[PDB]
Each structure stands twice: as structure tokens, then as C-alpha cells.
Structure to design on (372 residues):
RNA sequence: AAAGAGAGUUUGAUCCUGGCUCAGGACGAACGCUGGCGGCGUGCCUAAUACAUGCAAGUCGAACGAACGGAAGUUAGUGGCGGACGGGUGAGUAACACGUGGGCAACCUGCCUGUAAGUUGGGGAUAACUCCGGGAAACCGGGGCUAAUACCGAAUGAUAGAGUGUGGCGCAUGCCACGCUCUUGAAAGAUGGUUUCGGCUAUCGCUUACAGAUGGGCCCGCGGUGCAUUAGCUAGUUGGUAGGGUAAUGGCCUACCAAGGCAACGAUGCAUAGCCGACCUGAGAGGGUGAUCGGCCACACUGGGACUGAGACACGGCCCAGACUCCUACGGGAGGCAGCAGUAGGGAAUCUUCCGCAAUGGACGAAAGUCUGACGGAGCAACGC
RNA sequence: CGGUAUCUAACCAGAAAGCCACGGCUAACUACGUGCCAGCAGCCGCGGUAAUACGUAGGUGGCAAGCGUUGUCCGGAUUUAU
RNA sequence: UAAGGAACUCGGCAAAAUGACCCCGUAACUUCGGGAGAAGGGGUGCUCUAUUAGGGUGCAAGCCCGAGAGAGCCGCAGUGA
């Protein structure tokens, strides 16, 4: 089951996450299908950059955001679009 | 075994082995008594194709044979019917 | 019934494979040894890389024979080949494992370690 | 429709049934000096009706494996 | 754009040819003398040698029969899913193993997403439990009783099979769409709202079919090593005909028929070696390497085999054989650190038997939640920047 | 992780410098001891009672929490030369 | 003739052992012919398919020759002396 999740990279006690699409089976920092965006939690206003087009393409093919990703996509505001394109 | 979840697997697989071997050899007997009937051109050759067909695709629903395997064998037996 | 020039297989873990008997200990004109009897012998065939080499003079104990022993209760035992175990100055074997069945008569001769190591004491 | 690969060579042997041996000649420059060199490796093609004869110039197309070694089929007989 | 340094040494003295040596850079390095700190990384290259002792794979009572509680509320076994992922090692392998580019009209795919049909009616058991019997122990038999989303028939339902009609087609074998006749193939309930109780209904499920996505299987062109003081190699070998088997083509296997196939453009044999992205050096072209990080492969004490499953011929699963260690009441039994630490040995040479699931990602669950030596951190060593 | 990183308040020049070379290649030289001995060395080669080459001092030169030696690879090597 | 198997003896003298047909395979050395039946192994009986597949003979009737296979059956043993 392919799902979108964070990927930890950076230095010791300085994490930086890169939103990727990959299977659950593959390692956390291993194979991935493609990359969507990044996520910096250290910045006090957390800044995130997303494709907003590859995500919606993937979520109509059987992709599920994880716990932290869903908060990111909701705050950015594309799960509304996933709502509207589903029923419309 | 020495992981508690592994002791169950070794003994629950034997129960599946027992049930599978029993009805897998039931399938082969129906085929065994068809091709010999086809050679003799008896009247039983026609209706021995039906339960052999019934045995083959019942095994698919039971899940111990692939649907391509069942579909293939039925076609090849039908040729021998003459 | 094993006398001089008799040639018997060795049934332990030392380097030897086959043995020819030189002398039957235990008397002046003695001419035969049987199960449980120590015999002086020489190595005619050895496995490569073993402890005991070819052409070496050693003593050993007979452990099973084609003409076995009779018991006080009137019963007999007979094997299919003549086998041997190479021992030290005392009654301790020079190998670490023993192959095949072993006659019970070795216990009464106080060959306790060999009986302990044997896979079957018949 | 995706298209398979087609080659062109010269028949060498027809002593086998239903098949021919075709040598394909090709160029390839040397790795370090840079001089073009002949390179020929022969294939196996399926002769449906033994049409092709020794020495002919033919065209062969790629297919699924027809046998242990054959995975090409004869297409045209350009020259005899 | 970039763009290349020489020196010493044969002679009584010289100019050429020519070898040897030196000045530079880099290590997973070691040794010698010395030694303050912080940040970021690295640390068995040898014996794929043998392994004490702890922990690394479980979860679900919202699928089915118990103990505390005056019978409210929380905790073993059957059953489902997961253990094929994550983690380790480089032995073997000179070949479609890998890199790069294609083909599959010759293939499969649990969980995930969408859509369409339904989820109707029965039967016989068996664990647990309770007695008896055997053995030192591992553990094995016999009698009786019970349930389930456990198991087995039944009604209805195929683009599954056979026989056809049409069209539109393609790359030879052949493909796509629709229609007709005949024969086979399915299922499970649980937790709640309403009503009345009939019944309806929400959620998670269950069966069949088709799409997408994902992960794999097979075939092919080209590319990357030493020896000719290694010249022939092969017989299921090479092709064909019929059948068997597989998810799928194929000598993959079998019977028959013929004698073919490969090689001086280096077959065969011996020796060595996991492959690549990349790393070091170099003006460049090249030369040497493949530790750490990422992708693929092979292996799991040494050989062989298969079962269960969507997926294995399976690191902490099973059976047989072998070597080794251990427990035996002599009848028989139990094991596998190339998982994280740690021990002995080898070596010139390499670390703690530590703290947590708080973050990320995994398995189970409807969810809190449980498991996670993955992973986050900490400890030792001027090993490097 | 962890009262960790990070601030501000005060006292102390106080606890904190070694390693290798100095004939040429190659930056850096004088005394004393020894007398083909002890010894040095990558090459040329130094030592046989005035040694800038052996051993120790003073001084100097390269680096510095380092500095030297050994092993392996590329360069210089146009010394396999497309 | 049990167990042993040259311990006998000047010396394996004498005796024992191998022995037919078909198939596989075969070394040093060589004067290139050999060595060579080197060595070392495997199969043999009877019944059915079977007047076989196919050959010799004849104008036909018929007669003679007889490989491969499959399935079986019986003994301690199938060139059973
Ligand atoms: Mg914040
Ligand atoms: Mg049915
Ligand atoms: Mg001179
Ligand atoms: Mg020169
Ligand atoms: Mg340089
Ligand atoms: Mg240097
Ligand atoms: Mg210190
Ligand atoms: Mg120190
Ligand atoms: Mg290692
Ligand atoms: Mg090993
Ligand atoms: Mg243990
Ligand atoms: Mg734990
Ligand atoms: Mg309950
Ligand atoms: Mg549930
Ligand atoms: Mg329980
Ligand atoms: Mg793995
Ligand atoms: Mg390897
Ligand atoms: Mg590796
Ligand atoms: Mg590829
Ligand atoms: Mg019942
Ligand atoms: Mg019972
Ligand atoms: Mg019962
Ligand atoms: Mg139906
Ligand atoms: Mg039905
Ligand atoms: Mg389903
Ligand atoms: Mg994979
Ligand atoms: Mg294939
Ligand atoms: Mg190749
Ligand atoms: Mg075929
Ligand atoms: Mg083959
Ligand atoms: Mg080769
Ligand atoms: Mg250069
Ligand atoms: Mg380069
Ligand atoms: Mg390592
Ligand atoms: Mg080991
Ligand atoms: Mg299966
Ligand atoms: Mg295995
Ligand atoms: Mg496993
Ligand atoms: Mg494997
Ligand atoms: Mg694994
Ligand atoms: Mg283990
Ligand atoms: Mg064992
Ligand atoms: Mg370890
Ligand atoms: Mg050690
Ligand atoms: Mg040591
Ligand atoms: Mg966690
Ligand atoms: Mg989590
Ligand atoms: Mg779920
Ligand atoms: Mg645990
Ligand atoms: Mg822990
Ligand atoms: Mg870690
Ligand atoms: Mg440090
Ligand atoms: Mg040091
Ligand atoms: Mg404080
Ligand atoms: Mg401050
Ligand atoms: Mg002050
Ligand atoms: Mg100078
Ligand atoms: Mg002086
Ligand atoms: Mg000097
Ligand atoms: Mg000096
Ligand atoms: Mg000084
Ligand atoms: Mg100084
Ligand atoms: Mg520094
Ligand atoms: Mg250094
Ligand atoms: Mg060096
Ligand atoms: Mg060069
Ligand atoms: Mg006799
Ligand atoms: Mg006898
Ligand atoms: Mg003999
Ligand atoms: Mg003799
Ligand atoms: Mg005598
Ligand atoms: Mg004499
Ligand atoms: Mg004679
Ligand atoms: Mg005939
Ligand atoms: Mg005879």
C-alpha cells in the first residue's frame, strides 16, 4: 500500500524532512517513488512547500497520508480539494 | 521453534496440509478416470467431464489452485473428449 | 579368535583406519585374544591429517568379533566384523568418539570410558 | 502498437529443419584508439517453410522464444 | 572556459641512450614521542573462526467456551493478520549477476483507491475442558462434552470452458468489441440507531468481476579480467513432430525423428572477483579501488527436500544426513550472534553486556494501546575534517 | 536526550607545547666527545686523534595538539608514447 | 570345513581363485604397429504384448532367422550342470 510520508535527513538534533511517496515495505531512507516537498519543523512558524498537484493525482490512485502529513495537507488546504473533487 | 508465535505456525500448517492433500488427490482421481474412459470411447466419457469440471473450479473457490490452472486443464481435457 | 597377522578395523576417532596385530598379551604361549583383550598392533592404513600415523606401533582393545562371547545364562552374541579401539597406557581411549555397537563384556574388564562413549552396549 | 526489433543479415547454414543461421555484420569503434572494426555474431531465425537458402540476404524480426536458442523469425528474402 | 616545474647518480672531462632514487597528494590504517577543548563524521580490512549471558516479532475480547467483583467493570487457548518487512555479511558467482536500453499479442500480484452485482438457506465436527494410560524429561496415546468470521454440501450468480454469429483490426504465432446456445463456479458475521417485535439502517467486514496504483517473473542488443607454456568442446547436446507441467514462452520435462550446435571476432579449461552510483590521483586522456551512504544480487553451521501462503524452497519456521556442544534414569532428547551489546581466538590493528519509544517509519487493532537493539540519543578511541 | 545547548555575575595570567630536520637534493650552523670504533643512510655517500653528515649541547628552520616512521595507490615516468 | 588368511617354506611348491556372450571404459611408455582381453565395472532365467519391427526362401501356400523395448513371475543363486 503506497502512502506518502516524511523522510528524515539533516544533522544530529537538526532534523529536516522531505515529503516522499513510497511503499510501506521499503526503508525509511531508501527507495521512493517520487518527491513532493519538504518540511522544516525547527522554524518556529513551520514552513512547508508542496506540489498541490502530484498529491491530488496520487490520492486518487490509493495513497494515504500519515499522521503528520494529514495535518500538513489540511493546514495548507488541499484535503478540501480532495473532498470536492471526490463528490463532484 | 523458540518464538511463541512460531510454535502455532508449525502445527496450524499441518492441519492445512491435511485438508489440502485430501481434496487435491480427489481432483486427480476424477481426471484419472476420465482420460482412461476417453480412450475406451465409452458413453460415460461425456458425463465424466462434468464433475471433473466441477472438481477443478471448486478448488479455485477453496483457493488451493490458480484460476489459470483450472481454466487451462478444462480446455485441454475437452479436446480429448472426441 | 584373533591371533598374530590378523587384521581388524578400528572403530574410534583417532587417525587410524585398519590395524594388523603383532602380539597377544597375557601369557607365554598364548595364541588367541577375544572381546576385552588388549593386543599390540601396528597401523596399516590411516586417514590424512589424523593423530595416529601410518606404520606406528600401538596397543588396543578388541571391542567386537565375528565369534563373540557366551554368557553365564546360556546366551551368545556375534557381530559381523572384527573391530578395535586404540587405547592409552591406562584404559582410556585415544579418540573422542566410538562407532558401532560394543559388547557388554568390556564393562566387566573396567573399560568404563569406552562403554560411556559407545552408542550402544549390547 | 509498440514495435519489436528487426535486423538484416546473410544466411550461413540451413542443415537444420525449419530454421536458418544468419550472420549480422556491424561496426563498432575501438574503445581507446577509435578505429571502426568488423563485428559479426550470428543469430537463429525461424524458417516457416524452408524458403531461405544458403547465401541469401534476409530480414529477421524479434519474437518470443521459439526454442532454446531461437528468438527471431524470418521476414523477407531480399537477395538470393 | 581550462591548460603540463624538476633534481641526484655511469666519465679524467663531454654529449646521448637508459635504469634506480627523491621532492606532491590520499588512507576504515598501524607503530614511536607527546597531548587542552568544542562541532560534524568514522571505528574487526584477519578466522563466512567457536560462542557464555541478556534483549532483537508480535497483535486482536468489536470472531468463539474463564479468574477478581451481589453477578457491574479489567487479564490464558481455537481463529485472523503479521513473521517473505525492518537488520547482518561478501563466502560463492566470469553469468542476462550488474549498468544502460527495449519486448511480453507469453505473465502474476495480499494490503491500498474507484465502480457494478449480492451477502440466501443447512450439516457434521474438534481444540479448550474432564477422566484413564505411557515416559526420567521432552512430551505422546485412549474415552466423553462444547462454540465460532473454524470446516463441508445446497439455491442463485461468469467476459471460466465448449460450440458460434457479426463487425473493426494487427507484427507471423494472433488482438479488440458486441450477440446467441450449453455446462461448471460464492459468501460471515460483529458493534450501534430506529421501530414494534415485522423490518429498516450506520460502520468494519465477506464473495465475484473490471479498472488504477504498487511489487515481482521471463526474454533480448550493447558494456566492463589474467593465461595459448589452456585447441578443440558438447549428446538433452542442436532442430522438428505430439504430449506433460508452469502465473506465463521455452528441451523446462518426456516419446519419436534427423545430426546437428559453439569456437582463432578466442569455445573449453585454470586463476582471481559480488556489480554499480561513486572514491583517490591526474593538465587532460587515463591508472588504482569498490570500507562508510544509496540501488540490485547471493548467503544464513555444511549438503538435500518440500509444506503453508498473494508472496519463501523461508536469518531468530519444518523434515533427513554430516561435524561440533550440551542434558540423560542409556530408552532417547536440545541447539545455531555473517541481529544489538559482550566473550575467547587470530592479528600490527579496531568501541558499551547503556537510555527511550518523546520525533520518523514499521506490524496488529475500530481506538486508546501493545511490540520495535529499526530508529532517536548517550558512552569509549587525536581515527579524520 | 536533559537542567543538555544557550546567557550574565564575580576571581584568576594564573592549570594548558610538543615533534622532526640543519653536506646536496631541501628552508635552517657553531662548540665539545669519539677516532673505519661507536655509529648514520632515500640516493650520492659520511666516520682511519681540528666530523656544518656519528652522540650531546647552544642556535636556527618547518609544522603544531601534534609531529615522525612503515605499508598500499596515483603523479613526477613520454618508463607501453591514441 | 568354524575364526584367522602366507603367520608355512629355500621359494605362495601344491591347492584355491578368474574363465562364455553383449555393453561401458582403459595408464606409463613406444620402434607409432602396439602396450590391450591393460586395469575397473554392468547385463543374462521364465510369461505376455508377439507367427513383432525387420530379414532369407517361394508364384502363393507356407517354412526358417529373431534386436530393441515395455509390463509382470519365481528362487539363496538365472553362461543355475
Ligand atoms: Mg514549533
Ligand atoms: Mg457448490
Ligand atoms: Mg666519477
Ligand atoms: Mg632518466
Ligand atoms: Mg602535483
Ligand atoms: Mg611527501
Ligand atoms: Mg591528556
Ligand atoms: Mg598516551
Ligand atoms: Mg569481515
Ligand atoms: Mg562456513
Ligand atoms: Mg542463548
Ligand atoms: Mg524492548
Ligand atoms: Mg467478549
Ligand atoms: Mg474488528
Ligand atoms: Mg489470550
Ligand atoms: Mg533484506
Ligand atoms: Mg563473494
Ligand atoms: Mg559490499
Ligand atoms: Mg532493465
Ligand atoms: Mg456437533
Ligand atoms: Mg481427546
Ligand atoms: Mg473425541
Ligand atoms: Mg450458477
Ligand atoms: Mg453454484
Ligand atoms: Mg477482499
Ligand atoms: Mg525487492
Ligand atoms: Mg523463460
Ligand atoms: Mg556479456
Ligand atoms: Mg510444444
Ligand atoms: Mg537445456
Ligand atoms: Mg570461459
Ligand atoms: Mg601526467
Ligand atoms: Mg576519469
Ligand atoms: Mg564491516
Ligand atoms: Mg559461523
Ligand atoms: Mg501455496
Ligand atoms: Mg534451506
Ligand atoms: Mg524467518
Ligand atoms: Mg533466498
Ligand atoms: Mg529477513
Ligand atoms: Mg540467530
Ligand atoms: Mg541435531
Ligand atoms: Mg555482534
Ligand atoms: Mg582480542
Ligand atoms: Mg593476540
Ligand atoms: Mg515510536
Ligand atoms: Mg508511530
Ligand atoms: Mg486498519
Ligand atoms: Mg518483546
Ligand atoms: Mg531498548
Ligand atoms: Mg543509532
Ligand atoms: Mg577528537
Ligand atoms: Mg597515536
Ligand atoms: Mg542550572
Ligand atoms: Mg551574556
Ligand atoms: Mg584579571
Ligand atoms: Mg640550503
Ligand atoms: Mg672533533
Ligand atoms: Mg644530513
Ligand atoms: Mg650531528
Ligand atoms: Mg638543541
Ligand atoms: Mg622551534
Ligand atoms: Mg587544527
Ligand atoms: Mg599522520
Ligand atoms: Mg610510505
Ligand atoms: Mg604514463
Ligand atoms: Mg577354513
Ligand atoms: Mg569362513
Ligand atoms: Mg582377506
Ligand atoms: Mg602378501
Ligand atoms: Mg619360520
Ligand atoms: Mg631365504
Ligand atoms: Mg602353482
Ligand atoms: Mg512381422
Ligand atoms: Mg555354467
Amino acid at each position: 500500500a503506497v502512502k506518502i510520508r516524511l523522510k528524515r535527513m539533516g544533522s544530529k538534533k537538526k532534523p529536516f524532512y522531505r515529503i516522499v511517496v513510497a511503499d510501506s515495505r521499503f526503508p525509511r531512507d531508501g527507495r521512493s517513488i517520487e518527491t513532493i516537498g519538504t518540511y522544516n519543523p525547527l522554524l518556529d512558524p513551520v514552513e512547508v512547500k508542496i506540489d498541490e498537484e502530484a498529491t491530488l493525482k496520487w490520492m486518487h490512485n490509493g495513497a494515504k497520508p500519515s499522521d503528520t502529513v494529514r495535518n500538513l495537507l489540511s493546514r495548507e488546504g488541499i484535503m478540501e480539494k480532495f473532498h470536492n473533487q471526490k463528490l463532484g | 521453534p523458540n518464538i511463541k508465535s512460531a510454535i502455532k505456525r508449525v502445527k496450524t500448517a499441518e492441519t492445512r496440509n491435511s485438508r489440502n492433500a485430501s481434496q487435491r488427490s480427489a481432483m486427480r482421481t476424477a481426471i484419472k478416470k476420465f482420460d482412461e474412459a476417453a480412450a475406451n470411447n465409452a458413453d460415460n466419457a461425456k458425463d465424466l467431464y462434468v464433475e471433473a469440471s466441477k472438481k477443478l473450479d471448486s478448488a479455485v473457490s477453496k483457493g488451493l489452485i490458480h484460476k489459470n490452472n483450472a481454466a487451462r486443464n478444462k480446455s485441454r481435457l475437452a479436446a480429448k473428449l472426441a | 579368535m584373533i591371533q598374530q597377522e590378523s587384521r581388524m578395523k578400528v572403530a574410534d576417532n583417532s587417525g587410524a583406519r585398519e590395524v594388523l596385530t603383532i602380539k597377544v598379551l597375557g601369557g607365554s604361549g598364548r595364541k588367541t585374544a577375544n572381546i576385552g583383550d588388549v593386543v599390540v598392533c601396528t597401523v596399516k592404513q590411516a586417514t590424512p591429517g589424523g593423530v595416529v600415523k601410518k606404520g606406528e606401533v600401538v596397543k588396543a582393545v578388541i571391542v567386537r568379533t565375528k565369534s563373540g562371547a557366551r554368557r553365564q545364562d546360556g546366551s551368545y552374541i556375534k557381530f559381523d566384523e572384527n573391530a578395535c579401539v586404540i587405547i592409552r597406557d591406562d584404559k582410556s581411549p585415544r579418540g573422542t568418539r566410538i562407532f558401532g555397537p560394543v559388547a557388554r563384556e568390556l564393562r566387566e574388564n573396567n573399560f568404563m570410558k569406552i562403554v560411556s562413549l559407545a552408542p550402544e552396549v549390547l | 502498437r509498440n514495435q519489436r526489433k528487426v535486423y538484416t543479415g546473410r544466411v550461413v547454414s540451413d542443415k537444420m529443419d525449419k530454421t536458418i543461421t544468419v550472420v549480422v555484420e556491424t561496426y563498432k569503434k575501438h574503445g581507446l584508439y577509435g578505429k571502426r572494426v568488423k563485428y559479426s555474431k550470428k543469430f537463429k531465425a525461424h524458417d516457416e517453410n524452408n524458403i531461405a537458402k544458403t547465401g541469401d540476404v534476409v530480414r529477421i524480426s524479434e519474437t518470443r522464444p521459439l526454442s532454446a536458442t531461437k528468438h527471431f523469425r524470418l521476414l523477407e528474402v531480399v537477395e538470393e
Observations:
- Helices of chain B lie at 4-40, 44-62, 67-81.
